[model samples]
Target: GSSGSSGMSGGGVIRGPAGNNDCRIYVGNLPPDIRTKDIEDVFYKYGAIRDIDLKNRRGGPPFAFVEFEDPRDAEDAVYGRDGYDYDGYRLRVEFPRSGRGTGSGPSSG
Candidate 1:
């Protein structure tokens, strides 16, 4: 995907059946130098974060799972604001289908 900023305010939450809010967000395309503190700096604005888990690979890009107290806040983290720019990298944020595994694709928004 084009990693450029869209300047587009995301179309907002895509509420699934049962208004699913008990979910964690998959954050991808992170800069190698990024740290948990950096992630928190950007995400904490949306809501009260529960936890942050980073997945580090030997030589691959690192990713993370950011948990929020509210699913709607997670939704906002991905598709609510004008998108996120972390140290100049526009992050790819999406919801994982399963609470396990790598994760799905970018936000459809």
Candidate 2:
């Protein structure tokens, strides 16, 4: 068998197959004392957001998904909100990918 990088999914866990402008962005590094309103507020500035899928909990995945009515708006969100620092945490904002493997590693830019 193979034995290499033990953390098999340290890379972006591909969620699903790629399709048209998904217009969905992944939000990460949310602070503990965050609210759904807070998420919506921040994203509204980017554009017309349709829905939010916040993985809100006490101690679990601190991430969310924001859906846009327009793909162009999604692009703007990724560009301007990628490194948004809220409550001392730099957020990770970008489109979800399942198109193809961009290679794999523990984590890389």
- Best candidate, TM-score-wise? 2
Candidate number achieving the greatest lDDT relative to the actual structure: 2
- Give candidate 1 misplaced runs (Cα > 4 Å): 1-21, 81-83, 99-109
lDDT of 1: 0.69
lDDT of each: 0.69, 0.74
Per-candidate Cα RMSD to the true structure, in Å, reads 14.0, 14.0
Q: What are the runs in model 2 whose C-alpha is more than 4 Å off?
A: 1-21, 57-61, 100-109
Candidate 2 lDDT by residue in tens digits, 1-109: 9543422113343353334447889887777567777888898898778878775543444678888888888888888899999867788888776576556688766
State the displacement of the C-alpha of residue 35, model 1, in Å, after optimal TM-score superposition: 0.7
lDDT of 1 by residue, 13-86 (tens): 34322323464787887877779877876788887688888865543456777878887677877774335677
| Candidate 1 structure, TM-score to reference | 0.63
